[PDB]
Amino acid sequence: ANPTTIANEVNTISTIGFSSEVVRLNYLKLQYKFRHLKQTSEKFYTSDSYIGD
Amino acid sequence: LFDENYYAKAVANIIGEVKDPIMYKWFSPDQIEDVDLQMGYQKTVKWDAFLNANPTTIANEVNTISTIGFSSEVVRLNYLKLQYKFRHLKQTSEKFYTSDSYIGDINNNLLPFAQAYKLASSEIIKLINHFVLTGTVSIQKDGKNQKRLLPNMYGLLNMPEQIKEEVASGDKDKMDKIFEKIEAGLSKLELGDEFSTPMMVIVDPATSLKLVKPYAAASSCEKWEDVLIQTIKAINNREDVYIETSNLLKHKILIYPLNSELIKFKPSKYMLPTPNEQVDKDSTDVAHSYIDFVLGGLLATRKTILQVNIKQS
Amino acid sequence: LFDENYYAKAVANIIGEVKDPIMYKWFSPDQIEDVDLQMGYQKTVKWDAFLNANPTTIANEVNTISTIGFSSEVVRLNYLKLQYKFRHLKQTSEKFYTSDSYIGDINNNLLPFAQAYKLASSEIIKLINHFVLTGTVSIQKDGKNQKRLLPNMYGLLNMPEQIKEEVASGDKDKMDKIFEKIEAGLSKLELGDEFSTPMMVIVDPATSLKLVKPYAAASSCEKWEDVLIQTIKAINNREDVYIETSNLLKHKILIYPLNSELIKFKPSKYMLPTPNEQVDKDSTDVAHSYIDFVLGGLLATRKTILQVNIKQS
Amino acid sequence: LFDENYYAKAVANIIGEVKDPIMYKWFSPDQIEDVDLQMGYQKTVKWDAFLNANPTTIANEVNTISTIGFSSEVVRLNYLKLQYKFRHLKQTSEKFYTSDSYIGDINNNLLPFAQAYKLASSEIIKLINHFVLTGTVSIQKDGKNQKRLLPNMYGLLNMPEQIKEEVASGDKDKMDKIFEKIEAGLSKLELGDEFSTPMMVIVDPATSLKLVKPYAAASSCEKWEDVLIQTIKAINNREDVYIETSNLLKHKILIYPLNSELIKFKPSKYMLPTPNEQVDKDSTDVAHSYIDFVLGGLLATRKTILQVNIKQS
Amino acid sequence: ASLLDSNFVPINFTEFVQAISNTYKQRRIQFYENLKRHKR
Amino acid sequence: GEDLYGICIDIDEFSKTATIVPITNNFEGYLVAKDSTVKVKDKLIFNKDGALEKVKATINATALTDAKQISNEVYLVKVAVFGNKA
Structure with missing residues (x-):
C-alpha cells in the first residue's frame, strides 16, 4: 500500500511483502536404433566405389 | 552499538549492496544540495536589484544622483516523512532455517x-525515483489511488506555471506534428539571461524509438533526434543537449535546463531509506522492522520546464 | 545506569527544580515519620482501663469486690499506590524539535x-497536598466524581469523631457568630495532659480578610485575629499559635495542635512522585512515561480537631 | 549476559534443582540419540526383498524363470515445537512482597x-513423560479434548502394527487368564535375530500387586512375576528382564526389547523445557515469561511391542 | 559449554540455550552412569 | 449513523492527517456534543455531523459527565464508547 505518514501517534503502518519462487528445469533421455552391417561381413559387400547392399 | 545491535551491524555491512538512484543522472552535480530536516518547511530568500532612473553625469558639482532599489522573494519548500514496515526472521532463529542451498523459509516467505x-x-528507492520524476506517489500501474501530498511539494511533471503542450490523438504517430508542438513549447520557454545553459530531455521508450527513425519524401544522414538537438540548440545558445530515457514516463517529453540558478534540488539528508531503531519482537521467530524516508525539496523558476504530452486516446 | 538510561539521568538532573510540598508547613518536624511501604496497612494496639462500679467499703468481712475492666483497640492505617501516565518527545527526536528559544512542538503540545x-x-504534588488537607481525591472544582478510596484513609478536614461546628447561612458574614462557633468548638476540645503544645489554624482567604476587621462599637488596637490568638492561648497554656491561609480550603477553619502524641503523619517513604522504569516506545517520536505515588497515613486522636464550616448557601 | 539479564542467571541457578524425567528408566543409554532440530521432519530409507513365486526347475530348455522382487520404504519422524506462558513478579519488586518466611502474594497467587x-x-516434564508413554497430549484425566498432533508422531502405547491382547471383563482379576494372554502375545512377538537383548515390561500398580502373589495349590518360592520373567527369558536368550511400574498406565501391560536396532528414540536436543528471551513487562509488578519444548522422535519396528489391555467391567 | 562449569560465562542467549542443552545431555549421561536396575 | 467507522482523537493540520481510534476499540474521553441537553447516564448517538446527541442506537455510548460549554458552539462531554449494540 501507499506509505504511512508519521504524524503524531500511529500504530498501523503499511507493510512490504515478500515472495519466493521455485524454478525447475526438467531433462529427458531419448534413444534411437539403427541397423547396419556386421564388421566381419563387410568384405562380402565391398564394391568398386561403395560398401553396402 | 555493533556489539549490541546486530541489526545495525547488518545494515552497515549490507548498505553497499543497494544501487544509486537513477534520479542522479537527471541533475547537474551543482544542482543538488542536501538540507537538514525530516518534516516541516524551509524558506529561501532571493534578492534582486533594479535601477530607478537614467544615470547621472558627474560634471562640475551635483548633489542629486540616480538610485538603485532592491527587492526580495520568499519561497517555501515542504518536507514530509514516510515509513514502511517489513517482517523478517529473528537472528537467533536464523540458524534453524539456514539450509545448504539458501537461508530463509520458502513456504512462509520469510x-x-x-x-x-x-x-x-x-x-523504496524505486518509489522515491518515481516521486522525484512524476510528482506523485502511487503503487497502481494506472497511476490511481495516489497518496494525497502536501502543497509546495511538486515534481518535474507537475511543477506549476510551466510550459505544457499536447499532441492530439490524431497526430499521435506524426513526428512532424510532435516536433511542431515541441518547437512551440521551446519558443514559449523563457530563460532570461541564463539561456546559455546545457539542456536535458527525458523521453519514454516509445518516443525514443520514434526519434531514432531517420528524419523525413524520406531523407538520409539525419535523425529526428538530431533535428530536436538542433532545435534546442537554437534556444540554448548552441549549448549541450543531453537525452535520457526513463520507463517511468508514458507518452511524455520533458525538457529543462541543467542550471542551479533556475532549478535546484535541496533534498533532506535523510531522504534515502534509513532503518528505524524500533524492532518489534515476540516469543515467535518473526520480527518486524521499519524504514524511514523523506520526500520533497524541488525548486524551479516559472516557465522553465517544457512538458509535451502525446495523447493516445 | 546513567550511561545506559537517559531518562534516569534527566530525572536526577531535574529533580532539584521541583519545589517542596506546602503541606510540610502544616506539621511540626517531629510530627512526621516515614514508613517503608507501597500498598498495605500498618496496625497498632492501645490499651485502656475503666471502672465497672462504685467502690466497695472494706468493713468487717466481704468477698465480693468491685472490678476494673480493660479493653484493647486496634487502629489500622491503609496506604494506596496510584499511577499517572504522560507523553513526551523521544531523546533522539529532540534535535528535530529544538528550536531557537523553545524545545517541543507548540501545535501538538509535545x-x-x-x-x-x-x-x-x-x-501530582499539588494533588497530594490537596488530599492531605481535605481527605478527598478529585479533579473537579464542584468536588464531584471523587476517587473511591480505601477505609482508614482520612485527612485533617474529613477526620471523623472530631469537634465539628457549623455557621449558618444567615450568619455567613457575622464574624461575631463565627467566633461564637469557634469558641464553642474550642471549649469542646479535649487535649488532656498534652495541652502545653503549639497550635495551628488554617483558614480560607475570605476568613483571613474577615479576621483583620476590628473586634466588635469598634475596638482600638484589638482585632478578631488577636482575640482568636488570645482565646487559643488560653487553652494551649499560652503556647505559640500559628495561622496559615490555604487556597485549597473554602469557608472552612481547621484548628489542631502540633504535638506528635496526638496527631502523627506516617506516610510511605515513596509517597512523593517517583518515575517508573517502563517506557512505552514506538516507531514514531512520541514516548510514554509513568509516575507512581503513595497516599495515606494520617493518625489522629479522638476529639482533638476543630472543624468549622461556614454554610454559604 | 547474566549482568544484563537477571532471569537468565536465575534460570542457571535454579535449573540444577529440576529432577530428571522418569522416561529415562524406560530406555537404554544406546537407544537414545539427540538430533539437532526444533520443528520439522527427518527421513530414512529401508530396502527389503521378497520372493514372488516358487523356484523354477532348470530342466532341459526354459526361458521363463521365477522373479525376486524388491521394495523401498521411507520412514518419516516429525518434530513439533510448543510453548507455554507463565506469570511472575518483577525482579525489582520482591522487597515489597518478602514476608517473614516466604516471598510472594498469597492472596493473588504471585x-x-x-x-x-x-x-x-x-x-512440563510431567506432560512430556505422559506424551512419551501414551502418544497423546491432553490435560484431562479422561484423555479427551486431545491436542491434534501431526502424523508420524507416536508413543510406546499407541504405536500401530504391534501385538495387542485384550483380557476380558470376566477375567479382570484372573491372573491365570492374564498370563495366558501375555503368553499368546509373547508367542506372536517377532523379535527375530535381535532376540538376544534385554527386555522391559511396564505395568500398572494393580497388576503389579497381582503379580507379586505366589504362583498358583500354590507353589512355594515361586511367584507369578518369576514365571513371567522365566517366560520372557525363554524368548530373549536368557537376558535381563526389567520390570517397572508407572501410575500413568491404567490396566495396561507394555512389553518391548531394549535394542536400539528395533526401537530407537531420537528426540530433539531442545525437547526439555528451555526459557525464552521474551519477557513481557509493564508498569505493574506482574511480568510474563515463556517456556519452549519440542515433542516427537520415537521410531520402532513393527510387530515388536506387546500391549495387553485388561478390560475392566 | 555447560551450566555445570562455574567458569563458563555465557555471552548471549543462544550460548545460554546451548549450555542448557549440553547440561541436560550431561545429566542424562550421569543418570545412565549411576543407574542400577533391579535384576530380580 | 450506520456508516460510523471510528472516532478521530487527534489531528495534524500541517500534514492534514487525523489520528483515529477504530470503533472496535473502546475509548473514554471528551467529544463534541450537539447541544447541552445531555446528562449523566444517558444513551448517546453520533449524528450526521459526527456530534453526540441524546437518544435506534447502533453503538453503545454513555455520557459520564454533563455537557460543558467553552465557545458559542463548543460543547464537550466525557463519554465512554465500548463497541456496537445489537
Missing part, C-alpha cells in the same frame, strides 16, 4: 533481515 | 521528557 | 521467577 532490508530499500 | 516530568510531578 | 519457572518446568 527472509533474513539483511536480504529483506536490501529488497525493501531497493523498492 | 515537550521534552525532563520538562514534562517536572510539570507532571508538580501537578 | 510467585518469584525462580519458583514459578521451577514449578512450570516440573509440570
Whole structure:
C-alpha cells in the first residue's frame, strides 16, 4: 500500500511483502536404433566405389 | 552499538549492496544540495536589484544622483516523512532455517533481515525515483489511488506555471506534428539571461524509438533526434543537449535546463531509506522492522520546464 | 545506569527544580515519620482501663469486690499506590524539535521528557497536598466524581469523631457568630495532659480578610485575629499559635495542635512522585512515561480537631 | 549476559534443582540419540526383498524363470515445537512482597521467577513423560479434548502394527487368564535375530500387586512375576528382564526389547523445557515469561511391542 | 559449554540455550552412569 | 449513523492527517456534543455531523459527565464508547 505518514501517534503502518519462487528445469533421455552391417561381413559387400547392399 | 545491535551491524555491512538512484543522472552535480530536516518547511530568500532612473553625469558639482532599489522573494519548500514496515526472521532463529542451498523459509516467505532490508530499500528507492520524476506517489500501474501530498511539494511533471503542450490523438504517430508542438513549447520557454545553459530531455521508450527513425519524401544522414538537438540548440545558445530515457514516463517529453540558478534540488539528508531503531519482537521467530524516508525539496523558476504530452486516446 | 538510561539521568538532573510540598508547613518536624511501604496497612494496639462500679467499703468481712475492666483497640492505617501516565518527545527526536528559544512542538503540545516530568510531578504534588488537607481525591472544582478510596484513609478536614461546628447561612458574614462557633468548638476540645503544645489554624482567604476587621462599637488596637490568638492561648497554656491561609480550603477553619502524641503523619517513604522504569516506545517520536505515588497515613486522636464550616448557601 | 539479564542467571541457578524425567528408566543409554532440530521432519530409507513365486526347475530348455522382487520404504519422524506462558513478579519488586518466611502474594497467587519457572518446568516434564508413554497430549484425566498432533508422531502405547491382547471383563482379576494372554502375545512377538537383548515390561500398580502373589495349590518360592520373567527369558536368550511400574498406565501391560536396532528414540536436543528471551513487562509488578519444548522422535519396528489391555467391567 | 562449569560465562542467549542443552545431555549421561536396575 | 467507522482523537493540520481510534476499540474521553441537553447516564448517538446527541442506537455510548460549554458552539462531554449494540 501507499506509505504511512508519521504524524503524531500511529500504530498501523503499511507493510512490504515478500515472495519466493521455485524454478525447475526438467531433462529427458531419448534413444534411437539403427541397423547396419556386421564388421566381419563387410568384405562380402565391398564394391568398386561403395560398401553396402 | 555493533556489539549490541546486530541489526545495525547488518545494515552497515549490507548498505553497499543497494544501487544509486537513477534520479542522479537527471541533475547537474551543482544542482543538488542536501538540507537538514525530516518534516516541516524551509524558506529561501532571493534578492534582486533594479535601477530607478537614467544615470547621472558627474560634471562640475551635483548633489542629486540616480538610485538603485532592491527587492526580495520568499519561497517555501515542504518536507514530509514516510515509513514502511517489513517482517523478517529473528537472528537467533536464523540458524534453524539456514539450509545448504539458501537461508530463509520458502513456504512462509520469510527472509533474513539483511536480504529483506536490501529488497525493501531497493523498492523504496524505486518509489522515491518515481516521486522525484512524476510528482506523485502511487503503487497502481494506472497511476490511481495516489497518496494525497502536501502543497509546495511538486515534481518535474507537475511543477506549476510551466510550459505544457499536447499532441492530439490524431497526430499521435506524426513526428512532424510532435516536433511542431515541441518547437512551440521551446519558443514559449523563457530563460532570461541564463539561456546559455546545457539542456536535458527525458523521453519514454516509445518516443525514443520514434526519434531514432531517420528524419523525413524520406531523407538520409539525419535523425529526428538530431533535428530536436538542433532545435534546442537554437534556444540554448548552441549549448549541450543531453537525452535520457526513463520507463517511468508514458507518452511524455520533458525538457529543462541543467542550471542551479533556475532549478535546484535541496533534498533532506535523510531522504534515502534509513532503518528505524524500533524492532518489534515476540516469543515467535518473526520480527518486524521499519524504514524511514523523506520526500520533497524541488525548486524551479516559472516557465522553465517544457512538458509535451502525446495523447493516445 | 546513567550511561545506559537517559531518562534516569534527566530525572536526577531535574529533580532539584521541583519545589517542596506546602503541606510540610502544616506539621511540626517531629510530627512526621516515614514508613517503608507501597500498598498495605500498618496496625497498632492501645490499651485502656475503666471502672465497672462504685467502690466497695472494706468493713468487717466481704468477698465480693468491685472490678476494673480493660479493653484493647486496634487502629489500622491503609496506604494506596496510584499511577499517572504522560507523553513526551523521544531523546533522539529532540534535535528535530529544538528550536531557537523553545524545545517541543507548540501545535501538538509535545515537550521534552525532563520538562514534562517536572510539570507532571508538580501537578501530582499539588494533588497530594490537596488530599492531605481535605481527605478527598478529585479533579473537579464542584468536588464531584471523587476517587473511591480505601477505609482508614482520612485527612485533617474529613477526620471523623472530631469537634465539628457549623455557621449558618444567615450568619455567613457575622464574624461575631463565627467566633461564637469557634469558641464553642474550642471549649469542646479535649487535649488532656498534652495541652502545653503549639497550635495551628488554617483558614480560607475570605476568613483571613474577615479576621483583620476590628473586634466588635469598634475596638482600638484589638482585632478578631488577636482575640482568636488570645482565646487559643488560653487553652494551649499560652503556647505559640500559628495561622496559615490555604487556597485549597473554602469557608472552612481547621484548628489542631502540633504535638506528635496526638496527631502523627506516617506516610510511605515513596509517597512523593517517583518515575517508573517502563517506557512505552514506538516507531514514531512520541514516548510514554509513568509516575507512581503513595497516599495515606494520617493518625489522629479522638476529639482533638476543630472543624468549622461556614454554610454559604 | 547474566549482568544484563537477571532471569537468565536465575534460570542457571535454579535449573540444577529440576529432577530428571522418569522416561529415562524406560530406555537404554544406546537407544537414545539427540538430533539437532526444533520443528520439522527427518527421513530414512529401508530396502527389503521378497520372493514372488516358487523356484523354477532348470530342466532341459526354459526361458521363463521365477522373479525376486524388491521394495523401498521411507520412514518419516516429525518434530513439533510448543510453548507455554507463565506469570511472575518483577525482579525489582520482591522487597515489597518478602514476608517473614516466604516471598510472594498469597492472596493473588504471585510467585518469584525462580519458583514459578521451577514449578512450570516440573509440570512440563510431567506432560512430556505422559506424551512419551501414551502418544497423546491432553490435560484431562479422561484423555479427551486431545491436542491434534501431526502424523508420524507416536508413543510406546499407541504405536500401530504391534501385538495387542485384550483380557476380558470376566477375567479382570484372573491372573491365570492374564498370563495366558501375555503368553499368546509373547508367542506372536517377532523379535527375530535381535532376540538376544534385554527386555522391559511396564505395568500398572494393580497388576503389579497381582503379580507379586505366589504362583498358583500354590507353589512355594515361586511367584507369578518369576514365571513371567522365566517366560520372557525363554524368548530373549536368557537376558535381563526389567520390570517397572508407572501410575500413568491404567490396566495396561507394555512389553518391548531394549535394542536400539528395533526401537530407537531420537528426540530433539531442545525437547526439555528451555526459557525464552521474551519477557513481557509493564508498569505493574506482574511480568510474563515463556517456556519452549519440542515433542516427537520415537521410531520402532513393527510387530515388536506387546500391549495387553485388561478390560475392566 | 555447560551450566555445570562455574567458569563458563555465557555471552548471549543462544550460548545460554546451548549450555542448557549440553547440561541436560550431561545429566542424562550421569543418570545412565549411576543407574542400577533391579535384576530380580 | 450506520456508516460510523471510528472516532478521530487527534489531528495534524500541517500534514492534514487525523489520528483515529477504530470503533472496535473502546475509548473514554471528551467529544463534541450537539447541544447541552445531555446528562449523566444517558444513551448517546453520533449524528450526521459526527456530534453526540441524546437518544435506534447502533453503538453503545454513555455520557459520564454533563455537557460543558467553552465557545458559542463548543460543547464537550466525557463519554465512554465500548463497541456496537445489537
